[PDB]
Symmetry: D2
Subunit: 287 residues, 4 copies
């Protein structure tokens, strides 16, 4: 009967930007995948098709490139500038979501202007503005890790659908996906990102795993305990199964040496590790 326009947002998604810093002969590369979406009073645009309040997505795109010309210290700093510009430059725009993926490059044999892509991980940043408030979530993804031993899984319930054998020695492989929310905008973004990455890797490798859940808990704990500016960290870790192949039919044995790496299905362990007292339902996690 009666229909109502609810939450909404629009903008330009995946604007691929490469910013080269070449004031000196020692070039620097900043490679980003930027997305910009605005929130505010767009009622008439939906109900009547009145574009008076619709800042064209093409315009949002042009702004990204225009702002990049001035350069930026970090990805987060760049998103902060974009968000401030759109929310303050238009009265009907009250907020939005600006996100970016940052791709890393390494110099080829330390060359001044020749690089190769480091595809082992992708850094992420998301800025959300709501009226007078803003929040930033940084993250990492695509970082595949594996422990060839020092992992076990036993003591789990055994119902009539359980066939999994308990083990005290198995491979533990996953793709590290983690996102953490800052409780302040005054952060050394690059330094914290590198720190967190190292803490996650260290926790994963040095923790004698009794369950992926425990390893993940330890990874999140290390971060919260080391960084006061981080209120919570969410992780989504797939258990990429490496099956110990049965070689007995061929007259052999397999002392935890030969594995079949299955694509699907895979276990998916996810959790939020937070600082006691901090909020547990922040809007930035809604996307």
């Amino acid at each position: 009967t009666k229909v109502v326009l609810g939450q909404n947002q629009y903008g330009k998604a995946e604007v691929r930007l490469v910013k080269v810093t070449r004031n000196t002969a020692r070039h620097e590369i900043q490679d980003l995948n930027v997305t910009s979406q605005l929130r505010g009073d767009f009622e008439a645009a939906h109900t009547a098709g009145d574009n008076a309040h619709v800042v064209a997505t093409d315009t949002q795109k042009n702004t990204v490139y225009a702002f990049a010309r001035d350069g930026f210290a970090t990805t987060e700093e760049f998103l902060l500038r974009l968000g401030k510009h759109f929310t303050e430059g238009f009265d009907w725009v009250t907020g939005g979501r600006w996100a970016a993926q940052q791709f890393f490059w390494d110099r080829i044999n330390d060359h001044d202007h020749a690089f190769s892509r480091n595809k082992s991980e992708v850094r992420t940043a998301v800025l959300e503005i709501s009226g007078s408030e803003q929040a930033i979530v940084a993250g990492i993804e695509g970082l595949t890790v594996l422990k060839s031993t020092g992992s076990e899984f036993h003591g789990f319930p055994r119902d009539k659908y359980t066939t999994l054998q308990e083990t005290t020695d198995r491979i533990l492989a996953t793709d590290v996906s983690a996102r953490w929310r800052y409780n302040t905008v005054e952060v050394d973004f690059d330094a914290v990102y590198a720190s967190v990455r190292g803490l996650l890797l260290k926790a994963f490798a040095e923790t004698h795993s009794l369950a992926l859940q425990q390893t993940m808990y330890e990874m999140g704990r290390a971060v919260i305990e080391t960084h006061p500016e981080i209120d919570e960290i969410k992780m989504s870790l797939p258990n990429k199964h490496h099956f110990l192949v049965d070689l007995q039919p061929f007259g052999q044995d397999n002392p935890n040496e030969v594995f079949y790496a299955a694509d699907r299905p895979y276990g998916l362990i996810e959790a939020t590790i937070q600082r006691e007292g901090s909020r547990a339902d922040h809007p930035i996690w809604s996307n």
Copy 2:
């Protein structure tokens, strides 16, 4: 300071199931990609590696195949059975999230047991249980549509970064990604999915678009006005740009005939259309 385990869930993701119904010579095929995740008291699993409460993801996987043996009328019904099983079968499991993608097959020349995949759209379903509360969201994705005319965009704000020219005739192309939440479990799930799909396609095609936001609004309005069992529908529609190629440098005109279909960037318009007075932010959307 004090680290605490927040929201969490775990299970088996992407269990590929193909159920063949062959009681008669007229075979039927059900093809699904199922994910099962449990929620409850998993504190000890995370903080101490105590797996007493950890129903193995492998066991969750086994359950999917064992349950499929009995057959299921619809994907939603199948998910409902799985959800009830895990929540009621284990005291420390108070809820969860069970999802699936349904892939369509068509018979080859009406053959009894020979089929070809219809890859033009993927059907989705998600069930979330939280205590005594149950919620189901159905959806459709991967459905690409295009209008060669009957689409315009003008009257938008023009700032120093605006270069886009107004138009009264352009191509409008998008990939229909839609998800709607049911307000009851007693629904003819297959019949409603077929209906919603048709309403979305019909609205996209018949609406003289003055903006993608408007087309989306009309699509959502049609679904809500037609189905009493739906409280809201969310849509994420990319504006896949088809640029009219400038052939004037070659002395040729281009009367809206030759286009370059760019990959990225793309406009991304999203909105929620809801039944007036219905829940504003149902937890199921958080995931």
Copy 3:
């Protein structure tokens, strides 16, 4: 010691073109992904960086759009125009390879200018010119098919590494990747493509398969025997494994009903079916 420049080609790959025919209210859509590469004397370009002979890839791209303006009856006709243009327009260009993928669209409820994408298959065309001679290869890909029964596999040899159990009833699922070479350019391209597509599906579905190899042979035979204009057809068929799940651990039998559809690994059966007396190694297959 002495280095020589061997075979080489260059051009613009993946030019996405959408040609809308709108001389009447009944719009038509042609959607292509075009690749153009030239062959000839480019010795100096490689050894000295002298670009006098290098028709820019950007120019080749512009040519694709400029030619699309005039329209084209078929993808093959369009490729033929491009090939002729480049080979005859530049003395140092003696040939090349022009390819295209054609994507299909269906009208939305028979609407005059609103369509939805048919993603169930992709049509391909490849034109290769070498001096005064030219050859065309047409094909289809991405067409997934499945037989729920009427397939068996037994009688294979057994060695110490063999564990496979014979069967007289199994699922036979594959992705139809087929390419055929015409022995003349005077062909009703759209009609033959449609016919070939039909012959492949018919042979796949109606052949009681004793092996994927046998099914494939029958598919190729049907095509060669039906179309005089075709000298050979090459197919690459993966055997997409659908494992009958063992439910006995749960107290249930599985009468060929519940299957696990594994991603990898997969059997890969490939063969060339030819018209007796035709060429055995046409250069167009080298690419």
Copy 4:
């Protein structure tokens, strides 16, 4: 006319294998994606569905895992063992094609059994056996490189469809896909792969490029000139366009700093650099 069975091969594709070396506490990891296909007399299998000569694809897969148990020095040596086994183990199998992708892993903080994936490149190997002849092609793929300056493109012909402007400063970015054929199987495979990788990177970075064709020629020449065991190297290099964004409409200049990294289309430059007098068209290139 009569239908004939032409070239054909079959086997198991993409068998994912992970081999852990753990005789000492210092674990090593070998990660491969293996494909096995046999060639020989399979006439009856295709024409009559007689599987007497059909060594099961499942058996081939089992053989990969069984052989993995004994360990292997390099990926190429592993393929050689497999190839010799099938060709020498079955009289009707006269040869085949065995290939693999090798994925790299780095230790986490020099840990004994904890690693992370290096996804910046993928190493490939292809072995083809034809009777007594063993031909091997090694390669590298997925290695993206970029030069921020030291690249120009001018002096090309300006035909009636040429709009590209000459330039003496542009970005040159590509994905290094290279494959080289050894003229002997007695090679230090790991050492040569490392050397070749370094030579390609070096030539790409240090060559003042006047054309991608020139940069490619120099990359290939460096390889052939350095390795006597290599008869030819083939490269397929995309010219991933980084368009210098025009900011003048916004009142700004853009001194080679802000770029739009387009997805498609892209220039595709390919060539074969061979040792003078070597085989012109080795069958292994046909696949």
